[PDB]
């Protein structure tokens, strides 16, 4: 039966998928996260990822809560609320830099939460200061 086989394959892809955040660094309104693939699946279906950021924007010198979903794009010049990645396929053991275009520059020394979800389900949460 074929639902049985589809679910079999998917659940083992979920078991074997793992990602972690090596480093995070900010420049202007662009956030650069260095993602490392610690699983045994290839990651490439970035349209099906999630990238969610909760941070404190600097709007007219007022520190203002911001929560947003960012969508993937291959566009090399991404708009705010978009992100891109400098590899076509992130293989087990590899790293890649994910570039996220925030709508405002972060207010200095404010905390932030970055959630990165693979297309299979397993995710990573990073909490820190921007």
């Amino acid at each position: 039966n074929q639902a049985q086989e589809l679910n079999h394959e998917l659940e083992l892809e979920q078991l074997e998928t793992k990602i972690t955040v090596s480093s995070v660094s900010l420049t202007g309104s662009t956030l650069n996260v260095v993602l490392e693939n610690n699983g045994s699946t290839n990651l490439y279906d970035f349209q099906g990822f999630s990238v969610i950021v909760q941070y404190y924007a600097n709007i007219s010198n007022i520190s203002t809560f911001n929560l947003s979903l960012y969508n993937y794009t291959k566009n090399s010049n991404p708009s705010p609320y978009y992100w891109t990645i400098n590899t076509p396929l992130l293989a087990p053991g590899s790293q890649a830099t994910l570039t996220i275009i925030l709508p405002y520059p972060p207010y200095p020394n404010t905390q932030a939460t970055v959630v990165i979800v693979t297309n299979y389900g397993p995710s990573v949460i990073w909490r820190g200061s921007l």
Partner: protein, 115 residues
């Protein structure tokens, strides 16, 4: 002598999940719903949504215009897609208490998120 509740050895297949949920003000809650399965989920407007402090969840009506009610940016969810669910509340949330949101699609899939 070492004991821990549940385990990382015991897992099941995930087809639907809330990637993240949190309050965006004292009156509003955001949850991002993520279809990680292999088939489209449809008629999301007929979902059931509960929200409340841990142990005191309350039903929340769809699109009523009068709090407490919820909305969703699209009424179907394809494999890989995400939709945004917003709950509008009638009394503010306390800062020193954990809250849970829960969603039950028409097909019965039940997912929750605690913040």
């Amino acid at each position: 002598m070492s004991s821990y509740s549940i385990q990382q050895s015991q897992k099941m297949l995930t087809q639907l999940q809330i990637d993240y949920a949190t309050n965006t003000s004292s009156n509003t809650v955001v949850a991002y719903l993520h279809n990680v399965g292999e088939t489209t989920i449809s008629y999301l407007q007929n979902s059931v949504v509960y929200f409340g402090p841990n142990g005191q969840l309350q039903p929340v009506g769809y699109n009523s215009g009068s709090s407490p009610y919820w909305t969703v940016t699209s009424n179907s969810l394809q494999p890989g897609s995400k939709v945004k669910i917003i709950i509008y509340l009638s009394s503010p949330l306390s800062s020193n208490q954990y809250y849970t949101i829960q969603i039950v699609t028409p097909n019965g899939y039940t997912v929750s998120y605690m913040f």
